[PDB]
Design a protein around this ligand. Structure first.
Ligand SMILES: CO[C@H]1O[C@H](CO)[C@H](O)[C@H](O[C@@H]2O[C@H](CO)[C@H](O)[C@H](O)[C@H]2O)[C@H]1NC(C)=O
Ligand SMILES: CO[C@H]1O[C@H](CO)[C@H](O)[C@H](O[C@@H]2O[C@H](CO)[C@H](O)[C@H](O)[C@H]2O)[C@H]1NC(C)=O
Ligand SMILES: CO[C@H]1O[C@H](CO)[C@H](O)[C@H](O[C@@H]2O[C@H](CO)[C@H](O)[C@H](O)[C@H]2O)[C@H]1NC(C)=O
Ligand SMILES: CO[C@H]1O[C@H](CO)[C@H](O)[C@H](O[C@@H]2O[C@H](CO)[C@H](O)[C@H](O)[C@H]2O)[C@H]1NC(C)=O
Ligand SMILES: [Ca+2]
Ligand SMILES: [Ca+2]
Ligand SMILES: [Ca+2]
Ligand SMILES: [Ca+2]
Ligand SMILES: [Mn+2]
Ligand SMILES: [Mn+2]
Ligand SMILES: [Mn+2]
Ligand SMILES: [Mn+2]
Lengths: 232, 232, 232, 232
């Protein structure tokens, strides 16, 4: 069994174990701030440096994984609280899309909302061009910010949010459990064939974006992960 | 939203939030020990005292839940390490089955292996009469110890095991993530309609058992839980 | 440490975590309405269904607690706005006193105003038989509605009141902070030895009452609570 | 009556409503970071710019108040997690003590551990020179970091902590409730005569400090406050 596991209680910009893309910055409190509040169409992303093998071309096996993280989004004067954070998986050579307009692309897709990735978004603005639901929501994305599925949710400014994600390889099911401020949990699950959508090796990470008038603080506070690929 | 959430970092006899059934005991370290090492066919179960309303007949809605717990099973001389621990959900009036022979019934079913419950078992003995796989395993049970589905696992004597479970009501998916000794994760997921299998009010808990020759230490170390039912 | 904590942002009939006694009802908006506007001597009480161990005869330790709740009292035609709401603590077998005349008893005491409970009352009618102050007030009650202590307070019809209560077991101090409509705060604190006045296990809740001519809307809107008993 | 109330969901160093002293800084995420991790004997404090009238030399009346706040302390490599945060009340002309050695002085007292202030300290290091308890603790201080009283507590790195404080002028009682990561609540209360210890007009705020080998992240995330003084 090939296992990749790690844990971040805090981040240090000088740690090579993580790739910093775009406007991402690391605060003195150890938090990763994904976007630059003072830039138009800002986009920042963070990736665990080591690529993870999610499936074997020899056995045909797909890995299962369990990951938990905590983020925080907070409103800022005088901008519309947008656009949200997305936890994504993508080719190891993934980079912020060329000429990215940020905003509703969440830093992972082109203007049409397409890209090569699988993710769980925590969307705080309704983009009609991507068929977003009317309210804040958590969504399961497969190569598009036009979610395969979404569930109503509520982004509380200044609130620390906990998320737990389980990917069961046999059923190809991706399950998400979000722990809100008011105490309630929000869940969403969807069958996504990682082996059919992503290459053998991939990088896991977070991305957030903003536009001209849409901006807010996007912070990653902690992140634990364990993936196990059966090789027997 | 109707939410039920608790977090037991340890336990204590006298705590009104816990119903003890059978040979259950509380160790001075706070751990719960489910079976009596000196009793033939021992059965011990622990339940969260408060009944949980998992679905509403008035709205047809079903709750989602996130729960995680840690346990430990340890060998003893000279008995065969059996039988295992099961995290179950059952009618609020659930009691240890009458005339229970313990053993492979895990304290939740009758001799034939049938009962009224939904659970996640951590089986350490292969009972052919219940069609168990040949080795240790984690299984998803629905009214029977003859698992609807199982996955190879390994119970390490004295190893602390961590488990995270997510039930997404919308998809009716019950997914389990088990973090073992060597740090590898083992997962199993199964679509289970709690609404169709259980009554509106149920109780959550743990059960363990042994036989004349099959005995071992079964400990529950911690348990956190959050369930949310959309009331509207 | 043995801890009981919960957070109700709203309520719903059927939640097994709440015990309804008397004329209480749940409104479509999630608010709990304690009294029946059409019944004489109406009494409604709501209790957290799980008993709380506030102290242990074995260790002698006493729990500390923090709780916040919000309520609203609203006038109606053509009845006299009475009688008020009381947040109370009583033995777990507590029931509305047999033959309750409601009114100034607040649903927790007998006609003489005596009972077995500890509570914080928000009194909107001056009962000379219980030595009430001449104006609305907040009072600390120990086995009697003839408050051990009171402080002037005004109940504004239709106003949302927010309350915060801290019980420090070491000093045995029960401290109350009441946040009015105008923004002013009103506080009252009293040393109350719960270990000497109540049994080890008790229930927390709210009660309200009315008489033939005294009636008003008594609503409980939210309630968060956390108690912790040291078991070491 | 004379009331003062405010609420901070986030802070900005470019806001008049607040005084900054020492090495204090405001992070892009709105959080106030009291100490500088790169300085020896670092000391930082923040104060509500508007002095609050807590008692009257004309009437002898003393104000009551309710205030709550959330903070966060976090370890760093490779220093000792020290020294802590203290919520304090002091004369309006209060400033960081001249030649402050920071450290166990929490930035409010002299080397001997004396000063003019009343406060609630959240201590993460045991200074024997100030008779500190052997573990982390919450303390009530009256002109000295040699606490009038303390209670065992546990500072969890990276955890957001919520505090509620009530001062009841009639009983001169200062009660505190602190919400831990494991869910438990800790409380401590103490009779403190503010009229005798402090001037009519005072300033409320926060202070934190570090030493050569003792440093950690000290954050003040939010702060609500309401005080009411009767003028009649
Ligand atoms: C004319 O539209 C551009 O400028 C406005 C502000 O004047 C917005 O920034 C708009 O972007 C959209 O903004 C929201 C929030 O207000 C959110 O960030 C959306 O994702 C984003 O598309 C911007 N247009 C574009 C296409 O960038
Ligand atoms: C003749 O079989 C009974 O007695 C033997 C020991 O002499 C076992 O205790 C056996 O029970 C089975 O024991 C294993 C462990 O080796 C495990 O506990 C199985 O679940 C259990 O059935 C017992 N027979 C029965 C059916 O109770
Ligand atoms: C003769 O007194 C009885 O009937 C009157 C109305 O006709 C009142 O209901 C009175 O009760 C007292 O009413 C006030 C409100 O005006 C408040 O509810 C008091 O607590 C209550 O005693 C009632 N007498 C009694 C003792 O029930
Ligand atoms: C010789 O002692 C001085 O230098 C050491 C370096 O290891 C410490 O910084 C020490 O200060 C004390 O440090 C702890 C943490 O390790 C905590 O911050 C105490 O409050 C502080 O006294 C320092 N001495 C002094 C008096 O500054
Ligand atoms: Ca969007
Ligand atoms: Ca078995
Ligand atoms: Ca009265
Ligand atoms: Ca100290
Ligand atoms: Mn979306
Ligand atoms: Mn089995
Ligand atoms: Mn009264
Ligand atoms: Mn101290």
């Amino acid at each position: 069994a090939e296992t990749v596991s790690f844990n971040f209680n805090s981040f240090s910009e000088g740690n090579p174990a993580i790739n910093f893309q775009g406007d991402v910055t690391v605060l003195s409190n150890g938090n990763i701030q994904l976007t630059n509040l003072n830039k138009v169409n800002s986009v920042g992303r963070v990736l665990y440096a080591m690529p993870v093998r999610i499936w074997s071309s020899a056995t045909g096996n797909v890995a299962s994984f369990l990951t938990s993280f905590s983020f925080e989004m907070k409103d800022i004067k005088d901008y519309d609280p947008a656009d949200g954070i997305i936890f994504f998986i993508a080719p190891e050579d993934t980079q912020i899309p060329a000429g990215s307009i940020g905003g509703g692309t969440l830093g992972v897709s082109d203007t049409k909302g397409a890209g090569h990735f699988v993710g769980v978004e925590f969307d705080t603005y309704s983009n009609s061009e991507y068929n977003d639901p009317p309210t804040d929501h958590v969504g399961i994305d497969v190569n598009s910010v036009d979610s395969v599925k979404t569930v109503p949710w509520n982004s509380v400014s200044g609130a620390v949010v906990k998320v737990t994600v389980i990917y069961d390889s046999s059923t190809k099911t991706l399950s998400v459990a979000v722990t809100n401020d008011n105490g309630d949990i929000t869940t969403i699950a969807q069958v996504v064939d990682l082996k059919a959508k992503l290459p053998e090796r991939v990088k896991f990470g977070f991305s957030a974006s903003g536009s001209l008038g849409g901006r807010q603080i996007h912070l990653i506070r902690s992140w634990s992960f364990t993936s196990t690929l059966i090789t027997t």
